[PDB]
Ligand binder design. Structure first.
Ligand SMILES: Cc1ncc(C[n+]2csc(CCOP(=O)(O)OP(=O)(O)O)c2C)c(N)n1
Ligand SMILES: Cc1ncc(C[n+]2csc(CCOP(=O)(O)OP(=O)(O)O)c2C)c(N)n1
Ligand SMILES: [Cl-]
Ligand SMILES: [Cl-]
Ligand SMILES: [Cl-]
Ligand SMILES: [Cl-]
Ligand SMILES: [Mg+2]
Ligand SMILES: [Mg+2]
Lengths: 665, 665
């Protein structure tokens, strides 16, 4: 049968590439190839000629170690994955990295490897599909309509982020999300029973999922059957548990954890090929009949599906020209001409938390930017993230723009990544800066994939006060500044906050963390003028010395900028002139040339005090060896916030006092 | 009824404390007072006169926003929490912080606030209780035998950490763990149905838990019946869903999310006490007959119980004097005198990954230190954590010392906090450094509570190779360096690894992260002699300049110390003389006096190159303004590790070219 031979071809390309690499994970591709074959050639709607076709079904390999299965299917389907690419598995600069990397392989929809997260990112994709369908499907035109598939394994189902995401997806009745569970009773350290014994069916049923079981993971009629039932039932996400033998066919290693994560070896790979009836003498061998089978089943149907969808789009264009022009910009990642003029501008004196001015920026933008979409992990009323009038994102009204993620920071991070990968949306999530730790691995995959997600991180310091040190960030700032390709902006007032929002929405290729206060911040007088370009360049001179030549520089961020300005005013009354530097974003300031940075931090002004309510790690770069740091390198406390700040030294007097010491006065 | 009157006292005290603080969370205490009084006064075995009684039931309030419910029961029961303490809720330095703080309050077993983690810490405590029962109990002496209780809310049960922990606890059949779920259909933003609609009972049964439902959370008899059923089924852990009205008794605010986290206000407070029939008209008032009731239900029974256990203990001493002697030492936190003699010492040049030398050290410490208990998150084969011959921690064999946490990093981390809090064990957990992000919030809780937990974090760098950038740490070091009260050690070789393990085990008041390699690192010349004092001082000259007069300093950590010594050798062969500095721990170095710091880092020697395969943040502190940093501020790649390290510039020839450039040579 041609189906069997395609499946053996997949199994054997995967083995050989892993042998040549002397590295990788054979056991999962060997057992999962039939289910992956069946989904890829019989149910999934995609076009190898255009992996960016916007209405394609989205596929996610959550069990990322199995990546040679993905690459085998990509290559045989005619994606731009060549045979030489498969012979470069796990090699420097290749298009077949050991775990799936989005942006490095055509057709790969998401970077996985960190277990659990792929499922949750698929949930994100399925949410973007329903929200987009409800925004653009009008008057008989079903322009957004597609499934989200994922293959996961035992480890994915032990990770909490996948529990969070399954709960959320079932709650939202995401009927177009179908997960195939590679259920092989094996994890990395040995038998599944070492660590895991849940009734997975009963658990996914408690979330509101359709559960289906495949007894024989090699029987493609039982698999295709399960897939038909899953695609039929659009009222619930589906989990298809497919019982497999890890390393199926290896006479000595099938069913053992030894086959999870190291090459079969030349001896056992020979015996496996014999067990497969794979007669052929050559390695990396694909019979022409297999390329032909894949042409017939995938390449050629895929191009007609997309052609036929291009026809429906052209008619929608003519029927609904504005709506289609909006959709086309959304797909292209563009914002509506002139949206930015809708941003608020705040006068000096006006005092409100930067979480509150964030709240106002959001609603101001939300009208001008239809593509904005997001929410909070059960803190909308504290983070100030609600889009008023925007609607609740619910199965009865997927057009609603407010997502109620629940107390699931980590699912929220990864769903956000998934929505951004889908395309068509600008997306944000809110929580307390301290609990940004709960989604830390999702922030990392955003950075690695270069996804311009936006984190709304409020309650940024010890000024939080009474809820105490579990709720008071100290190190989180430093911990994000050290992450590559993560933009971090801690705006100093309402105007820097609108600037920060603007830059974050203009980002195309990296996540932005917005660090915001619980407590009021009075608006500075220069920021209305300078914030957008000032924040654009990471740091600037928000308040220059009045006598032009500063005797020392005060360096501050967020709320502390106001503190430093009031110290400046006290100091100049005494005849001591300093320049205050706002430093809303280290990463963007380091992106500028030294010509600019030297205009902000003039080398001749060696006396520099840093002022920031957070760990000191890193501050020596900017204050230098004659400078001083006023920071916090200890945990906080449970007390009114202005009192903590005082006992920790963030007072006008102590700033003046430390500045005077720097100058020998 | 005296029962009602005590329950109403709890409620009023909670309301009054929040009013006076003008901050706090009345909703949960108001709804959950009955269940907590029932557990506290009728089932828990505890002694207010000794909160450290070792065989007490352990209680954790996972829903830590309800702190005043805990402080009320502690005050009323005769723990060292005064009325003045209750009147200082949420104030500076007070014994009643806004969320419970272990070590800041008598009777408080864990710091909570961050949702989900309370349940998983309680799982760890129950794990501790069974490992210690299996170790010390003998026929006729069930000397270790007590329950673990927690109270959680809806938010706890959305958190991934509590799904992981529940799964593991069901798998481990921890029948003595009983969780009371305050099920009030409300969360912080509104109704539970915004975000959460699952069948909790069905999910928890899928884990292997017993599920019990109390329909009227004010009926203390129905609560008592569930606790009796739950305490009687020791084959499974129990979840009791207690249907409660949040803010019960407040005629306006009961059952709304506005009573979650703000004071009632004086009006609603008056109206609430009216509904309760509380007519004393004095804030912070306790009827004398309520104290007397708690003294009859808690104080006197508690002293009798500990006293009976102490009689038991002395009987156990007589019949099993050696085990009783070992038990007493474990309880008091001591290590077997002389244990450190057992640590291995490695000849120079012996070449071994520090994960493998960690493995060796682990089994050396384990043979000499019975109380060592630990495991990995499905990465024992790769982290090298297995205790050989130590047995498997299962219900067959709770005396087994190897714990299979599964792919549950965060539950692992939180459960380690639980075991350290219980007392009597030295605990560790293994996973990839890059996946330490998955347990970040529990690392923070260890630091905050000062628990000498040990993290075994292998695969520390790009040397990991073919698995790619999702698996290669970059920023993790900087992220842990910035955290208060966390010790981070990245040993240079096998001897610094031995010394690191020794210091992490010797710790009493802070956790320790061990940053270990995948790849071999040769053992340096001088570490056999210098490692212990050297790592103890955080940084030390490991290879001083041959001629005694350094032209520059090479600063390095971990596997890069090797590289630095080769460069030094090459440099010396051209007439250039540099000193090499090992810095296994920044935190330990900063704890040295300046006189010693200036001796390792002579202010005279301005020309310094730091060398570390991770983010640059904070190295300017040690290289200074005329310094240079050879670091990695980008993500990694999929390739053989050697290939990546060379492309990223960690080669002998490149360190030499940098050093010469520093010296204008
Ligand atoms: C978050 C995370 N933790 C740990 C790992 C290491 N790891 C990779 S696969 C795996 C488990 C393998 O078991 P399963 O998912 O059942 O896959 P199978 O071996 O059956 O292919 C683990 C722990 C990981 N990649 N991500
Ligand atoms: C990890 C984490 N996320 C968010 C918060 C903020 N927060 C505190 S309580 C809560 C949820 C409130 O619901 P529930 O747990 O049901 O408590 P109830 O209001 O019913 O007392 C949230 C999100 C937190 N403390 N920790
Ligand atoms: Cl608040
Ligand atoms: Cl104790
Ligand atoms: Cl203590
Ligand atoms: Cl004995
Ligand atoms: Mg498996
Ligand atoms: Mg609730």
């Amino acid at each position: 049968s041609i189906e069997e031979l395609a499946i053996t071809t997949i199994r054997t390309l995967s083995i050989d590439a892993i042998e040549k690499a002397k590295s990788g994970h054979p056991g999962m591709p060997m057992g999962a190839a039939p289910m992956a074959y069946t989904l890829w050639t019989k149910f999934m709607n995609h076009n190898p000629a255009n992996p960016n076709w916007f209405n394609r079904d989205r596929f996610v390999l959550s069990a990322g170690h199995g990546s040679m299965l993905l690459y085998s299917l990509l290559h045989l389907s005619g994606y731009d994955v060549s045979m030489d690419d498969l012979k470069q598995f796990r090699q420097w600069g290749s298009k077949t990295p050991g775990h799936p990397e989005y942006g490095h392989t055509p057709g790969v929809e998401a970077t996985t490897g960190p277990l659990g997260q792929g499922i949750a990112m698929a949930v994100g994709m399925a949410m973007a599909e329903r929200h987009l369908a409800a925004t653009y499907n009008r008057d008989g035109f079903e322009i957004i309509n597609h499934y989200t598939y994922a293959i996961c394994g035992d480890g994915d189902l032990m990770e909490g982020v996948a529990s969070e995401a399954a709960s959320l997806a079932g709650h939202l009745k995401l009927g177009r999300l179908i997960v195939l569970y590679d259920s092989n009773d094996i994890s990395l350290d040995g038998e599944l029973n070492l660590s895991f014994s849940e009734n997975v069916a009963q658990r996914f049923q408690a979330y509101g999922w359709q559960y289906l079981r495949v007894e024989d993971g090699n029987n493609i009629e039982e698999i295709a059957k399960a897939l038909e039932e899953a695609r039929a039932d659009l009222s619930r996400p589906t989990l298809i548990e497919v019982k497999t033998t890890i390393g199926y066919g290896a006479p000595n290693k099938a069913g053992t954890s030894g086959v999870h994560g190291a090459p079969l070896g030349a001896q056992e790979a020979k015996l496996t090929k014999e067990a497969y009836r794979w007669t052929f003498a050559e390695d990396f061998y694909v019979p022409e009949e297999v390329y032909a089978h894949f042409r017939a089943t995938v390449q050629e149907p895929g191009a007609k599906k997309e052609a036929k969808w291009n026809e429906q789009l052209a008619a929608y264009e003519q029927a609904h020209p504005e709506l289609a022009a909006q959709l086309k910009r959304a797909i292209e990642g563009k914002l509506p001409d002139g949206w930015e003029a809708s941003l608020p501008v705040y006068e000096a004196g006006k005092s409100l938390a930067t979480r509150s001015s964030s709240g106002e920026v959001i609603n101001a933008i939300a009208k001008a930017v239809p593509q904005l979409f997001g929410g909070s992990a059960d803190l909308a009323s504290s983070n100030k993230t609600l889009i008023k009038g925007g609607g609740n994102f619910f199965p009865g009204s997927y057009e609603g723009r407010n997502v109620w993620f629940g107390v699931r920071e980590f699912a929220m991070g990864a769903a956000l990544n998934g929505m951004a990968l889908h395309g068509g949306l600008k997306v944000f999530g809110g929580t307390f800066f301290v609990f940004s730790d709960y989604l830390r691995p999702a922030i990392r995959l955003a950075a690695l994939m270069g996804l311009p997600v936006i984190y709304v991180l409020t309650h940024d310091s010890i000024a939080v006060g009474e809820d105490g040190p579990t709720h008071e960030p100290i190190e989180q700032l430093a911990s994000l500044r050290a992450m590559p390709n993560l933009s971090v902006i801690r705006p100093a007032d309402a105007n820097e906050t609108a600037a920060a929002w603007r830059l974050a929405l203009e980002s195309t290729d990296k996540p932005t963390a917005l660090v915001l206060t619980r407590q009021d911040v009075p608006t500075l007088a220069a920021t209305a003028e300078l914030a957008y370009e000032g924040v654009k360049k990471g740091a600037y001179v928000v308040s220059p010395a009045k006598n032009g030549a500063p005797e020392a520089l005060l360096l501050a961020t967020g709320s502390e900028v106001g503190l430093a300005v009031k110290a400046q005013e006290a100091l100049a009354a005494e005849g001591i002139h300093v320049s205050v530097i706002s430093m809303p974003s280290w990463d963007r300031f380091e992106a500028q040339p030294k010509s600019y940075r030297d205009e902000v931090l003039p080398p001749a002004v060696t006396k520099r005090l840093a002022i920031e309510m957070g760990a000191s790690l890193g501050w020596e770069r900017y204050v230098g060896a004659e400078g001083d740091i006023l920071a916090i390198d200890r945990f906080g406390a449970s007390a009114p916030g202005e009192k903590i700040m005082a006992e920790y030294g963030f007072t006008v007097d102590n700033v003046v006092r430390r500045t005077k010491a720097l100058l020998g006065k």
